[PDB]
Amino acid sequence: RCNGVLEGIRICRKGFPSRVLYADFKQRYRVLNASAIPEGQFMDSKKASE
Amino acid sequence: DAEMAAFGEAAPYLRKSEKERIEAQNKPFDAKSSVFVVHPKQSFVKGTIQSKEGGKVTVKTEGGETLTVKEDQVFSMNPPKYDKIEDMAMMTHLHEPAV
Amino acid sequence: SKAAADDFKEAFLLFDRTGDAKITASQVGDIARALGQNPTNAEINKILGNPSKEEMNAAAITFEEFLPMLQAAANNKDQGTFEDFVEGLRVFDKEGNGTVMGAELRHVLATLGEKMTEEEVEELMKGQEDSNGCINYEAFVKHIMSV
């Protein structure tokens, strides 16, 4: 609390709380439109998730 | 795994084996029931929701305990996908306990 | 109503392979489309189940159930607006010209929502997409609404 950590989380959550790292995003969710999400993730680690 | 070499020896303290991960993120999860909760002695411990008192909650514990606590003494629990997240701020559950 | 269109009964004799004047419940989706109705496959699925009708076990039909199911699907033809079909694909690619890159439309039509086979996706792009890899959806959606 006194760190600022809990306040950074607050401000985040007012905002865009959860933030996924791209690969961490690919792997876990490729399966959703499997063909088109996998291609995206593989083809550009970032551009993929896009 | 492939990547980690540079560290190699440090690796285990930086990152976990690609299955330790996998074995952790890919596991059974029941959102609607799994939760974090307030706790008089220990700050926040985890538990499973048992019933619902309309604005009270009864929960089991992880150690084995049952408490009926307010609705807001109860906090969700992140899917396993967020086990030992490098950046807690990527979690979809920005709580006090989850952190 | 008849306007009693008796050609719906003559088309049921072209889709019944046994000649007994019954059409199985698995053919009713495609025959509603061949009579000039486009109900989505989830809608065809719901209605069926809605009426405690299981498309999982053997099915037969009679004209007396297929006629009112085509008349219940015929009210939903007011959902077929071509403004939203061309504007959907206009938001799918940059710049002021209606062209989807080949593989973008093929992977979206096979994996997003109601799964269309890649055989049917290739049969719907065949002729409208040339060797530049760019599908002009102004003429593509025009020809898709020509049938």
Task: Describe the protein.
Helices cover 48% and strands 0% of the residues of chain A. Chain A contains three helices and no strands. Chain C contains eight helices and two strands, in the order αααααβααβα. Chain C has 147 residues and is mainly alpha-helical. Chain C is 48% helix and 4% strand.
Rg for CA atoms of chain A: 15 Å
Structural class of chain C: mainly alpha
Work out the helix count of chain C.
8
**Termini Cα gap of chain A:** 35 Å
What overall form of chain C do the CA principal axes indicate? elongated
Secondary-structure element order of chain A, N to C = HHH
Briefly note the structural class of the backbone of chain A: mainly alpha
Count of distinct strands of chain C: 2
Summarize the main sheet of chain C: 2 strands, antiparallel
Strands of chain A, total number: 0
Largest beta-sheet details of chain A: none
Helix content of chain A: 40-55%
Order of helices and strands of chain C: HHHHHEHHEH
What is Rg of chain C?
Answer: 18 Å
Query: So what's the oligomer here?
Result: part of a larger assembly
Number of helices of chain A: 3
The share of residues in extended strands of chain A comes to under 5%
What helical percentage do the residues of chain C reach?
Answer: 40-55%
**What is the strand content of chain C?**
under 5%
Domain EF-hand (chain C): 7-38, 41-76, 80-115, 115-147
Subunit structure (chain C): Myosin is a hexamer of 2 heavy chains and 4 light chains.
Organism (chain C): Gallus gallus (Chicken)
GO molecular function (chain C): calcium ion binding
